[PDB]
Design a protein around this ligand. Structure first.
Ligand code: HEM
Ligand SMILES: CC(=O)[C@@]1(O)CC[C@H]2[C@@H]3CCC4=CC(=O)CC[C@]4(C)[C@H]3CC[C@@]21C
Ligand SMILES: CC(=O)[C@@]1(O)CC[C@H]2[C@@H]3CCC4=CC(=O)CC[C@]4(C)[C@H]3CC[C@@]21C
Length: 445
């Protein structure tokens, strides 16, 4: 009783890994044991199994393996994501998550921060690279209501830059091999140096800030979330050590920026190929709950007042989920992940991307199809896990507020004498990437 084994030794190499983990499915089925690295890792490729070992069992495949690459960022140690399970992490998640849920509703700021962006782009009328503009749109936003609420392009462009440079340094064979070949002796490798050096800015920018927060403190929450966490820790009613706050900020402070940006960028790349969905959206937008051209409705309760949107976003998050294989889960108790018994400690890899192409539940999976509301099944882009996501709300929101006014203000047009991007890069890393388009950005309603 155990999942099958694929006869390979470095499946990790090879393009479009998510589409490959799917290919093996033709014979094996949803669950198969595979060697992504040098160790046999059990994958899952179906909305059913990837949900059974995530929601049903819950207790079992909830932890995360500590590989020699995670404890590299441990510092004092502990935190969201990388950190393993343990009762501390549980209470650690609940604290840094309630912050994102917050007398200071983050709803308004988001809808405003994006407006400034529209104008900033509206003055361009040229061919700005969307990736940075939006890749900086969210940064200008998570930075306002999470750490000292600076928002200033002086402290934002500094934190935003720390994000991108903190990614290509963690997701590079140079630093990855260290995990596959631990016995390596860690002969000096160039990548490790570039990481340790860039990982400091991430530790420093939070240390120099967390202090200002410490002193400028009052009875409740300061402008930002830091004041909440940095306070909701030194008052625990009985671990949750002070250091935890330093890390909790990181995921959101410098983690919020990349993931959501990619989703937004991907969506734009799709509308470029489908003008149909673009204008059908422009009409369904104002002729649905926005008879005007601005500052009218466009929110939460209304959120239903916009069908094509709640749909378009659902597709983009299903065809190109920003995080595809999500993160590696580890088993704590021997349990069955379906079909076959699974040994404890076994690293589980929930193939989200693949489960989204299950043609047994989603029709014409490969085809951008906005339509689904009526209704079509749900697609897990944020996982469904005791780890689920810690900011699924913030994310889901930005994709609504940003896209909404993105269409209304501008046309969304292709670069001059250029080809539209798409299809997905082979250098798939922690978060799924995108090619570099140059969308035009104009409209005169
Ligand atoms: C809509 C864009 C996003 C997508 C598709 C996405 C997807 C995911 C996925 C698949 C995971 C791993 C789930 C697991 O395997 O257990 C994850 C984890 C996480 N995400 Fe996101 N995410 C998005 C946006 C965000 C944003 C904007 C934030 C910042 C508030 C965020 C913060 C996190 C954190 C902190 C974790 C780690 C949770 C843990 O402790 O396990 N995500 N996300
Ligand atoms: C148990 C082990 O030997 C490891 O922890 C050491 C190397 C780990 C790779 C690292 C790269 C990677 C990136 C992803 O996004 C999905 C998960 C994998 C494939 C992950 C699987 C578990 C591996 C193989
Ligand atoms: C998009 C997502 O899923 C996340 O935002 C949720 C967890 C985030 C980890 C958090 C830990 C970390 C520490 C660093 O110093 C470098 C950046 C990472 C690897 C960072 C990458 C983006 C991730 C994976």
């Amino acid at each position: 009783h155990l999942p099958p084994l694929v006869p390979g030794f470095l499946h990790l190499l090879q393009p479009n890994l998510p589409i490959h983990l799917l290919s093996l499915t033709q014979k094996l089925g949803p669950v198969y044991r595979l060697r992504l690295g040098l160790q046999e890792v059990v994958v899952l490729n179906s909305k059913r199994t990837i949900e059974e070992a995530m929601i049903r069992k819950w207790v079992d495949f909830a932890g995360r393996p500590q590989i020699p690459s995670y404890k590299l960022v441990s510092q004092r140690c502990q935190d969201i994501s990388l950190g393993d399970y343990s009762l501390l992490w549980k209470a650690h998640k609940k604290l840094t998550r309630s912050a994102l849920l917050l007398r200071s509703s983050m709803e308004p700021w988001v809808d405003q921060l994006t407006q400034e962006f529209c104008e900033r782009m509206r003055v361009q009328a040229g061919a700005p690279v969307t990736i940075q503009k939006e890749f900086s749109l969210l940064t200008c936003s998570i930075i306002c209501y999470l750490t000292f609420g600076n928002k200033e392009d002086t402290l934002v462009h500094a934190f935003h830059d720390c994000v991108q440079d903190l990614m290509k340094t963690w997701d590079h064979w140079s630093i990855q091999i260290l995990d596959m070949v631990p016995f390596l002796r860690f002969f000096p490798n160039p990548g490790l140096w570039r990481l340790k050096q860039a990982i400091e800015n991430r530790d420093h920018m939070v240390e120099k800030q967390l202090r200002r927060h410490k002193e400028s403190m009052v009875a409740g929450q300061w402008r930002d979330m830091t004041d909440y966490m940095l306070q909701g820790v030194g008052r625990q009613r009985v671990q949750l050590l002070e250091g935890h706050v330093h890390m909790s900020v990181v995921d959101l402070f410098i983690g919020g920026t990349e993931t959501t940006a990619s989703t937004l960028s991907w969506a734009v790349a799709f509308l470029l190929h489908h003008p149909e969905i673009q204008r059908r959206l422009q009409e369904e937008l104002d002729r649905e709950l926005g008879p005007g051209a601005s500052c009218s409705r466009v929110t939460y309760k209304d959120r239903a007042r916009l069908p094509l949107l709640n749909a378009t976003i659902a597709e983009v998050l299903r065809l190109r989920p920003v995080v595809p294989l999500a993160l590696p889960h580890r088993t704590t108790r021997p349990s069955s992940i379906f079909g076959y018994d699974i040994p404890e400690g076994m690293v589980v890899i929930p193939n989200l991307q693949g489960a989204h192409l299950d043609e047994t539940v989603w029709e014409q999976p490969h085809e951008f199809r906005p339509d689904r509301f009526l209704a079509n099944p749900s697609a897990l882009a944020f996982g469904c896990g005791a780890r689920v996501c810690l900011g699924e709300s913030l994310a889901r929101l930005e994709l609504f507020v940003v896209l909404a006014r993105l269409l209304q203000a501008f046309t969304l047009l292709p670069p001059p004498v250029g080809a539209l991007p798409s299809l997905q890069p082979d250098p798939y890393c922690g978060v799924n990437l995108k090619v570099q388009p140059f969308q035009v950005r104009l409209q005169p309603r």
